[PDB]
Design a protein. Structure first.
Lengths: 1011, 1011
């Protein structure tokens, strides 16, 4: 049979799901979480062979190793080993939509392993094999005999091997199919890979054993008392001497215990469960678990005899916390959460979808270090270790079933069909059975982008009945269907409604108060971090803090799914969709992270960190008011540092410890300051520093900051007297001005400053010209494609309007000599096909001091698409090591993404002024700048700028960062104004009106001088 | 594979479920529900062979008929043909409980059929086979090639044979397994049979076809306006030229119509169902459907090209009705129902579980003629014609999923197990998909006696999402769980609580008001009609009428499940559990019907008819107030007949047309009546008669009656003197009295009347003695067995106290001669092992008129269990043809089951005075009798009696009615007092206290005379 083309068969001979087991045979090791000799890993070197279809696998493989197989590491995705290509498709299925069939050319991975077992395992007990993750479906044989089959690439599939085992060498043969009917439920937006990608193990349990256990914690009104209730189930022969004891430990101290024989309460007319027992433990003043203080206890479940012999033990970490929705609010331990969440796929640039402890830890540390307190398992149950880490390090988790049918038309075609209820059910039920005891899991999710089908309603109900301790959410079909306890839209905007038929995305503030609505609202996905993005992030935060029922959301997403490829040289580079010959593909849409694949942050990460701070501040006079947003912990590892600076120059600073209760406030009166009558703006910067290291941060970690302008002293003094006067030399073709060893040349045909010299040294490679466009950001492009243009996209709108192609017609170019200067006046019109898009009017005033003051007045046609920027650009001859500026920084910042940047004097190496987005675009801009220094040059004004060795033209024409080459000299883009970058989504225009350049008339001025 | 030992495989290659199709190619034939040339029946003669296990079937059978096969009729249950035995087990499974496995010895039925297929069916379109019922699982081969597999004995399994058939002769091969994993969900209390027991048919559909259609009817506030909405789905060639036209007809008039192209509304981000269309038809003043007036329209669903070519048409009967629960009440068309329901299994004494039109009709007529308006499909979907019939004749139906796991321990072991969710889902979903357009179905049920599992919660929700038009109910787990919209207990009593742990059965009146409860309460099963039962029926009806939220119930059950067996002589006899060698078995527990297996009524039927009347009456002076309980109809086929009689002698009578609106009242003042001087009691009897025949009844059918005592003239008349005095003659052994041609002999050693002569003919075969016991009723025995006594059962309590074996000890016997009479006085004590149980003191006064007056005063020890009766008995020498009595009748009636009986003078053949319950017991009693005539004898008094050719001893000792033998003479039991019969259930004592003989002292008197 082709069990892989039949949704009614999702497994054969598979054992029931259950929470993590180790079959410890020693209570103290179980207590300590130490290794169990009854649980062995079979990870390591296996033998593998790839085939084009299951029909090509030779029968001989069942009995013996194929000489042509290779030895490979398991776990692994075979594409990562180069056997076939990974495919990056977003919504459209990677296979023909024809349920339940799959391609007859179905890549098949034949894995095998030779192994043996302890003699005692041949003697007695049950030995099972556990495959934590096999993508997408597989058949298993042991010593040539068929064992079973399994589907669901994201949950463990276990089989009893007891009767197949033999003395000596044994051989497993695992036939893995790339595609199966399970693939119709695995349409997540990510690389499409396959293989045995999570752990493989053997677990030796007794025949009379703990087959399942559920831990629940209920509380009194003030959480000062709890009842821990643990239902324990057994398999095997019941005997009157058996007992179960459940003990609760706080570290090495036993705090509570309960023992009882098997036999549950009567539950119906036929009696009760003779094979279960529920123990109830009273716990006084329990230490509560939260992401803020992940307090944990240890529960040890022992199956033993009345007379004291242990048969076996199981165990888990227990977090005492209550999750409930009441009055429209999601409460944890009675307090309303504010979710600083992120969606996180399991992705590694070299290993594909194989997760390792080091990586998970790294991600958790970075998440916490960047003020995240929650994660959504987009969009499947994760590797088991993730939950352990989240329980211990403390992050709220949304555990999500591995069901995504995005590519169907309409999206609920399968989810509304009863024939698919069975396969879907297991993806939900087996997840709960496995994960229900992890305290970090606070919400269950039914899957993602599968429309809204009756199967969802049935499953929603099943979970609510089986585990009332956690709310259930699901975004499909409109985000507020009968299958979700939380309104949980993806990409709904803060103030702006997007009233799509059937499934509108209302402004989140409006959504809450729709007639009859009362649920809390937490975005399952928001702030699409694709390339230069995160524009408008602060808008969300502000709303979340203002509206009780807006309880946060999960950013999309943590890490870019870029894959490493190698060039002819052996040099690695980041690859995206299509880079493997995969087609159709969705190009750079797999890169939406706050961090690059290797975990290096993108600039947007700081913006997120700042907006998600846990301390709020207000300034009044000299009093700084600090407000704690923590719900549970006191600020016991924080100090406030403050500093006052005059235009970058340090004037004063100090420190004061924070001593604020959760939700409390603290007033700090700044000492009396000094009075510098020296002109300039004074600025106050405060930072919260954690003096002590923690399990997730180093000593000195900065967790929050904020700045304010203090007194300003406008300069009223006149600059020193003009020693000299510059000379004008005219030709039909140029206006040349000379001053000392300095010269400026203005082309009279083009009307631009075409050259400048310090001595005989030329300073420009390209003339100084107005610039109205930018190499488009991913948000500017959306889903627009050459092949399939989206005319509504920003980029398309600017192309169609001719912005990229308009030519500067000269309207006027004059020169006047003044008393102590030369004044050049210019006027240009940029037109397109006869339409004048923009008019720039300028004056350049060069005086005896050698400074060139530029004044620019631009007019933009009201009917042309608002332009990406309004500035000047040129290629300087010079290449200098550093960039020093007085403005916002130090990192890249844009108008709608600069709240995290601070105003001060920064100085970085030039390359730091370039942001290496894998898909290149305008980047590295810094706003609010009053002075910029590079080499001998100094520009002053109130502008935005970027500076790098790459032209806007080069960035726009180059699809991968590894292909960029430094140009001669340095490209400087100085803007009077720059359009926001947007990001509410990356497939429709998202830059908010206030960050669009629509004023029609714009003015700016700059002074260019040397030194 | 052993697919039949795997709950994960419930079918292979089976087509989707859908409502009844016929694929008409002419719309008028569809409109008329005439036969379709595209839907053929394959019922008829098939070939069959029985095997002890599937492993015994020879491979040749796939390719050709087995010479040893027999030709048999299909559909059939093979047990009915004698291949193996049917098994009658109630709760305990017929197989070892070891899910999901079955016995390796598993009776296999090999059916085959060679049949014809016309080439035209194969030139185009699709040809499918449909098996309406195969118990319990089967594999299908066509022309030697494997086609597929199916489970669920009670719904249709359809397979596409398009590619397997060829023009001309074709051969099917069906391997039917008696046991499969489906059996774990098929543990209903009925005979365990197997085979192809529902219709087999062949359906041709076009390639582009109607694959499903759902019809809904929504109304305005007063039901004066409706919108019929029909969603239609297609499969096949989707093109712009297709259209759907739905037309609605009332008779030959088209009332509405709509046409539309395919493509439903947008449902989500991926669009809508391009293969679906919803038509909405407005209908003004629709004729509403109810069980009272089953008004129907015909909807024709035409799939056609826009230019006019009908592709195919499907159609259904539509009943405009709304079902909804509001404010705690179940309403139909806005009015609260009162369910006069009955549970009905599909059972035929000769054909087993095979149903036929005639039988169904016969049952529906009798149900209606007996004032039932509702039926519950206990406990599985029914043969398809049942629904058509309830739609047309008018009965409300509870459609029930084929899920019963009663024998599990605890009962929800499988239903709370997610691994059984898929198998259960199919049973619920496919039922709804098939029966959702039938107006008769008003409530869906999740199955029966399967405890309460999370699977039920999930499924409850699925239905509520897919079909909001009908409430969902389910009794398991305590009858008021979260999986039921209706409190639907089985056997909860009216006033008496039964507080079992976990699943108590509260009094129904108390249940409605438990803190927080608001749902309506309708018993899914009540009034267990096993043997002589239905005692207490009236108590239920009084509560139902009194409490709004008590909306009725469904009696258990309609027809006894007895099977015909043939004796040596070839005479048929009714058999029950164990009569086929089947063991273990549950004996007579399969017979619980209001009617015998051949549809002959049991006496309880008339009690149900009466209590379930649709007209209530009150009498005030000579005014009769009639109140209608109809909700929607006027009494347009009814007249009131009234009659007054003096002790059975007709005095006056009349008829008055009834004209009452639904829920209305009518007052009818009767004529000045007879006030006769003559002694006796005047009795008024009124009957409601339907003058015109209907679809379900004959002209003159009586639908209701009631009686009242009017004036009573007590006799004060002295009997004239007798020209005679009886003479006494004594001896040590006897007292003999003679008077004219009459003689009486009283034995002085026994203390009883041992003989009487009329003329010179002996009148007694056994002496006249007190009797305190009865041949126990099924309700007296309950579950007690020799092998496992239930000491709480009435029969056991009487046995243990010695009632059945107590011997009369004579305490006194004297004779005295009076003025004009001889008086004999006796006293006897009945003892057991030293305990005096009862004392009987009597006097017999024989006067000169020849009458013998007997006075009896009994004492019953307060500490002995209340006795079954307090009466006398004797075997008369005479056998006479008729029995004439003045008292309640004419049918058998008991203290707690006599409301239906009317007081009058009745006269029946002797044989009618015996009720042939299959399992013999005390029977034929008539209560409230004032005079009894049999042969030359007349007895007068105020007593209850029975009279037949069978002694109480014989009835108690014989297990089956066909084994009873008429004794010499006639046994007469004349009771002063008789215990109620009970019946609230048949497994615990159920006789209400007011019907138990607990007074301690009892007095009765009779006069025995001639004529
Ligand atoms: Mg499959
Ligand atoms: Mg998606
Ligand atoms: Mg593409
Ligand atoms: Mg099966
Ligand atoms: Mg027509
Ligand atoms: Mg043709
Ligand atoms: Mg049952
Ligand atoms: Mg038995
Ligand atoms: Na909030
Ligand atoms: Na993406
Ligand atoms: Na502190
Ligand atoms: Na680019
Ligand atoms: Na009622
Ligand atoms: Na029964
Ligand atoms: Na009438
Ligand atoms: Na009997």
């Amino acid at each position: 049979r082709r069990d892989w083309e039949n949704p009614g068969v999702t497994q054969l001979n598979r054992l029931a799901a259950h929470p993590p087991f180790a079959s410890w045979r020693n209570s103290e090791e179980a207590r300590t979480d130490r290794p169990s000799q009854q649980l062995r890993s079979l990870n390591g070197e296996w033998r593998f062979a790839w085939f084009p279809a299951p029909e090509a696998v030779p029968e001989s493989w069942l009995e013996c190793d194929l000489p042509e197989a290779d030895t490979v590491v398991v776990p692994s995705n075979w594409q990562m080993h180069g056997y076939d290509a990974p495919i990056y498709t977003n919504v459209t299925y990677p296979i023909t939509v024809n349920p339940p069939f799959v391609p007859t050319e179905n890549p098949t991975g034949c894995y095998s392993l030779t192994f043996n077992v302890d003699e005692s395992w041949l003697q007695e007990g049950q030995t099972r094999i556990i495959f934590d993750g096999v993508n997408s479906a597989f058949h298993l044989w042991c010593n040539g005999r068929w064992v079973g089959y399994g589907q669901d690439s994201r949950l463990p599939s276990e089989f009893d091997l007891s009767a197949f085992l033999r003395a000596g060498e044994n051989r497993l043969a695992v036939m893995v199919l790339r595609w199966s009917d399970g693939s119709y439920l695995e349409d997540q937006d990510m690389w499409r890979m396959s293989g045995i990608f999570r752990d493989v193990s053997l677990l030796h349990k007794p025949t009379t054993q703990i087959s399942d256990f559920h831990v629940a914690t209920r509380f009194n009104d003030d959480f000062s008392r709890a009842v821990l209730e643990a239902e324990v189930q057994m398999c095997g022969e019941l005997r009157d001497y058996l007992r179960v004891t459940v003990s609760l430990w706080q570290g090495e101290t036993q705090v509570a215990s309960g023992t009882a024989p098997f036999g549950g309460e009567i539950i119906d007319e036929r009696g009760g469960y003779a094979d279960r027992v529920t123990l109830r433990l009273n716990v006084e003043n329990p230490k509560l678990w939260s992401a803020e203080i992940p307090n944990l206890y240890r529960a040890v479940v022992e199956l033993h005899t009345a007379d004291g012999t242990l048969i076996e033990a199981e165990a888990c970490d227990v977090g005492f916390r209550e999750v409930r929705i009441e009055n429209g609010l999601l409460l944890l331990n009675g307090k309303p959460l504010l979710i600083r969440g992120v969606n996180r796929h399991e992705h590694h640039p070299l290993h594909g979808q194989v997760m390792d402890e080091q990586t998970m830890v790294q991600d958790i540390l970075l998440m916490k270090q960047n003020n995240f307190n929650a994660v959504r398992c987009s969009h499947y149950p994760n590797h088991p270790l993730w939950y352990t880490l989240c329980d211990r390090y403390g992050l709220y988790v949304v555990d999500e079933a591995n069901i995504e049918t995005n590519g169907m038309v309409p999206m609920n075609r399968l989810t509304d069909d009863p024939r698919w209820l069975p396969a879907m059910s297991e993806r939900v039920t087996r997840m709960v059975q496995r994960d229900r005891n992890h305290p970090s899991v606070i919400i269950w999710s039914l899957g993602n982008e599968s429309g809204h089908g009756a199967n969802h309603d049935a499953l929603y109900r099943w979970i609510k009945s089986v585990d009332p301790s956690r709310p259930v959410q699901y975004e499909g079909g409109g985000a507020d269907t009968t299958a979700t306890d939380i309104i949980c839209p993806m990409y709904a905007r803060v103030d702006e409604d997007q009233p799509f038929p059937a499934v509108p995305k209302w402004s989140i503030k409006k959504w809450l108060s729709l007639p009859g609505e009362t649920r809390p609202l937490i975005l399952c996905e928001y702030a699409h971090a694709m390339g230069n993005s995160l524009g408008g992030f602060a808008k969300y935060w502000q709303a979340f803090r203002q509206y009780p029922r807006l309880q946060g959301g999960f950013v999309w997403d943590w890490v870019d799914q870029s894959l490493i490829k190698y060039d002819e040289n052996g040099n690695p580079w980041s690859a995206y969709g299509g880079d493997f010959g995969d087609t159709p593909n969705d190009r750079q849409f797999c890169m939406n992270g706050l961090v690059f694949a290797d975990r290096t942050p993108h600039p947007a990460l700081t913006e997120a960190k700042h907006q998600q701070q846990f301390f709020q501040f207000r300034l009044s006079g000299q009093t700084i008011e600090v407000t704690s947003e923590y719900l549970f912990r006191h600020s016991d590892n924080e100090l406030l540092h403050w500093m006052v600076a005059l235009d970058g120059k340090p004037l004063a600073s100090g420190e004061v410890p924070l001593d604020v209760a959760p939700q409390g406030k603290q007033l700090i009166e700044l000492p009396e300051l000094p009075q510098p009558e020296s002109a300039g703006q004074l600025w106050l910067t405060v930072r919260v520093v954690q003096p002590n290291a923690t399990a997730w941060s180093e000593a000195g970690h900065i967790s929050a900051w904020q700045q304010w302008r203090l007194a300003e002293n406008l300069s009223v003094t006149l600059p020193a007297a003009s020693h000299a006067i510059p000379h004008l030399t005219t030709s039909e073709m140029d206006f040349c001005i000379e001053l000392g060893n300095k010269r400026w040349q203005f082309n009279r045909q083009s009307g631009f400053l075409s050259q400048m010299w310090i001595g005989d040294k030329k300073q420009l490679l390209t003339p100084l010209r107005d610039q109205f466009t930018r190499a488009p950001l991913d948000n500017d492009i959306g889903v627009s494609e050459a092949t399939r243009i989206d005319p509504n996209a920003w980029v398309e709108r600017w192309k169609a309007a001719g912005h990229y192609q308009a030519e500067a017609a000269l309207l006027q170019c004059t020169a006047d000599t003044l008393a102590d200067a030369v004044l050049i006046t210019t006027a240009h019109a940029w037109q397109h096909q006869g339409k004048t898009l923009f008019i720039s009017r300028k004056t350049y005033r060069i005086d005896g001091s050698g400074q060139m003051a530029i004044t620019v007045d631009v007019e933009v046609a009201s009917d042309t698409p608002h332009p990406a920027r309004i500035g000047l650009n040129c290629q300087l001859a010079q290449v200098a090591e550093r960039v020093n500026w007085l403005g916002l920084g130090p990192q890249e910042n844009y108008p709608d993404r600069l709240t995290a940047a601070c105003f001060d004097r920064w100085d970085l190496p030039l390359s730091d002024m370039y942001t290496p987005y894998v898909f290149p675009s305008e980047n590295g801009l810094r706003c609010g700048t009053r002075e910029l220094n590079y080499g001998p040059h100094q520009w002053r004004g109130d502008f935005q700028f970027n500076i790098s060795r790459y032209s806007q033209q080069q960035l726009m024409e180059t699809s991968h960062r590894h292909l960029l080459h430094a140009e001669e000299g340095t490209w400087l883009n100085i803007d009077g104004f720059h359009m926001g970058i947007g990001g509410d989504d990356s497939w429709s225009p998202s830059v908010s009106a206030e960050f669009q350049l629509s004023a029609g008339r714009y003015h700016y001025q700059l002074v260019w001088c040397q030194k």
